[PDB]
């Protein structure tokens, strides 16, 4: 069958690993069968990303799919108030980084006139060379596609920029000359440290946030050893 999904390989549950209850529903299309960095809210409950306490562990919400590739909503481990296991120490196998939404890098080869982007295959009209970031964002939302100025985030004050989409189904691309668009993909790497973010993502990059959660060894494996977030 086409795919592997992340799982715990070794998980003990008498050490620092613990049962809790979910404070919110898990989004099956975005968060099931993925390695989620979790914290605790102002109640006793597990929440994806930093809660009140910061990142305190990792969680995999293991969910069955039908042969058509879709996930049952009738589960007992994914709604608010459902119990879930959380790990501080163990091994995860078939490991992958966790990312939410889509992200694109934009670079302009032109120093003249205007360049043309596309959103799901229909064009922006014209983007001048040397825009502001807000002018670039405006040209993306101005397409009659029904996507809006909350579906997108744009940053960049140079020929380079980046578009971040919270949705999964918007593809930003180039269509004219003078501009290129690369989708910023993410794959597991051998011998690499991984960090849990306040978003709940896990990434080989640490930023202004990113507690340590583990390191890989071979890329398909993560040795989990969470260094809990602290005041």
């Amino acid at each position: 069958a086409l795919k592997t999904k992340p799982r715990w390989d070794k998980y003990d549950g008498y050490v620092g690993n613990y049962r809790g209850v979910l404070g919110e529903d898990i989004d099956l299309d975005t968060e099931a069968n993925r390695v989620l960095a979790v914290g605790t809210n102002s109640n006793g409950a597990i929440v994806v990303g930093a809660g009140q306490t910061g990142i305190k562990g990792l969680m995999i919400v293991a969910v069955g799919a039908d042969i058509h590739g879709a996930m049952l909503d009738g589960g007992i481990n994914n709604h608010a108030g459902d119990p879930q296991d959380v790990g501080k120490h163990g091994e995860i196998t078939n490991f992958q980084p966790t990312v939410f939404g889509r992200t694109f890098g934009v670079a302009i080869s032109a120093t003249e006139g205007n360049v043309k982007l596309a959103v799901n295959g229909v064009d922006t009209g014209n983007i001048a060379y040397d825009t502001s970031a807000a002018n670039l964002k405006s040209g993306i939302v101005a397409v009659d596609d029904g996507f809006t100025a909350d579906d997108f985030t744009v940053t960049g004050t140079a020929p380079n920029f980046t578009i971040v989409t919270t949705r999964t189904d918007v593809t930003i691309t180039a269509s004219g000359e003078g501009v290129t668009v690369t989708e910023a993909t993410s794959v597991a790497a051998a011998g690499t440290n991984y960090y849990g973010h306040a978003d709940g993502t896990v990434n080989a990059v640490k930023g202004s946030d990113g507690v340590y959660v583990g390191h890989t060894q071979e890329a398909d494996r993560l040795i989990v050893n969470v260094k809990d977030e602290e005041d």
Binding site: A1, L2, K3, T4, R7, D9, K10, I67, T93, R221
Partner: protein, 381 residues
């Protein structure tokens, strides 16, 4: 014989009678029967070698994962294991065909019984030609079909065509969803390397001489006249070099040879199924006939470790009262008209999508289905 199709209510003036000269034209209806008998024999041999009766209307295929050991250590523990499975399904269609005949009372009052028996015989001939056309469409028509079976819709497939589930991995051979058995020669004339390429399209899936698969090449005379020239180590059409000799069947005319032992090995058997074999080239038994259109090669594998059957399944209706060719009493049963109907239901599809291949011999572009066997082109061969 002649491609003229008289269709209507049979009246007086459509009557055939003894001539004033005493020629009984009603004796002559079945005079073609031996030229028909050769076409009939050719269609019989192809149908029994290309078809099987469908007993299971929907067929499953699965893909299963794998696992690995690792090297042990004295204090740690190895990784776990699991298998992911998925399944796909495919079916065979079913369609309905009919014909009428109708007579006026003035026809029926004067007609010789032999004139209406001849019309009945022409209907049975059209029935056989309908079945042959639809079997040959199931093999040549490159496009996927849809059908509803027990209140659910299914895909109905030809051979691999760049659509549906990819072929399974076999040994070091891996295939993607674009994989196709309907390839082209990329040259205007047949090479020996085309016969080796067509052979590789079956052997890639383990359907192979080493696995015990037997091989039939069906070709037009326009191709076999070129294949008969292939000699080991001799340069050929398009700069190909032949890897084998064409070896003639024992029914071919006698020939002189450089050695009193003529061949290393045997001649091919003179018949494959009921078909007449001209010879063999490499592992192909070669049959020539122009029911294969010019510029097309059809390679079919049989038997071996994978138990390759005949490539096309024939589905009849599930109710035994709907099976076969049937005669239905008409809506007019009295005066001034009488009518009645002939009806058949059947349909077609492929289970073992890799067990055969088709090559169109041309320089460029996609495979084209020959119009003689493109689905929409009619109900006769």
């Amino acid at each position: 014989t002649a491609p003229v199709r008289q269709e209507g209510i049979m009246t007086q003036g459509d009557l055939v009678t003894v001539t004033s000269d005493g020629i009984d034209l009603n004796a002559l209806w079945n005079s073609f029967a031996e030229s028909i008998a050769i076409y009939n024999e050719a269609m019989d041999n192809l149908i029994q070698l290309l078809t099987y009766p469908v007993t299971v209307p929907v067929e499953p295929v699965v893909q299963i994962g794998e696992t690995t050991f690792e090297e042990a250590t004295e204090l740690g523990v190895p990784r776990g294991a699991g298998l992911p499975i998925e399944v796909f399904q495919m079916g065979y269609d079913l369609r309905h065909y009919d014909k009428r005949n109708a007579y006026s009372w003035m026809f029926l009052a004067d007609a010789d019984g032999r004139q209406v028996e001849a019309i009945h015989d022409a209907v049975l001939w059209a029935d056989k030609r309908l079945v042959f056309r639809k079997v040959m469409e199931a093999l040549f028509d490159n496009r996927t079909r849809r059908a509803n079976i027990r209140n659910q819709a299914y895909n109905v497939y030809p051979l691999y065509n760049g659509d549906g589930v990819p072929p399974p991995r076999f040994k070091n051979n891996v295939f993607d969803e674009t994989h196709s058995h309907y390839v082209i020669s990329h040259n205007s004339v047949v090479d020996s390397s085309d016969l080796e390429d067509l052979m590789e399209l079956l052997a890639e899936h383990g359907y192979s001489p080493q696995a015990g698969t037997q091989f039939l090449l069906l070709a037009n005379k326009a191709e076999t006249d070129a294949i008969r020239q292939f000699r080991r180590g001799v340069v050929n059409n398009n700069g190909a070099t032949a890897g084998y000799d064409f070896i003639p069947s024992p029914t071919q005319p006698a020939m002189m040879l450089p050695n009193a032992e003529g061949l290393l090995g045997n001649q091919p058997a003179p018949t494959f199924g009921g078909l007449a074999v001209i010879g063999s080239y490499g592992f192909w038994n070669i049959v020539e006939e122009d029911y294969i259109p010019p510029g097309y090669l059809v390679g079919v594998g049989y038997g071996g470790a994978f138990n390759l059957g005949n490539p096309v399944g024939l589905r009849q209706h599930a109710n035994p009262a709907m099976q076969g060719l049937r005669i239905i009493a008409g809506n007019y049963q009295r005066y001034p008209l009488v009518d009645g109907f002939y009806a058949r239901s059947f349909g077609t599809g492929v289970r073992q999508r890799g067990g055969a291949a088709i090559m169109q011999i041309k320089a460029s572009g996609a495979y084209e289905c020959p119009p003689i066997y493109k689905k929409g082109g009619g109900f006769l061969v």
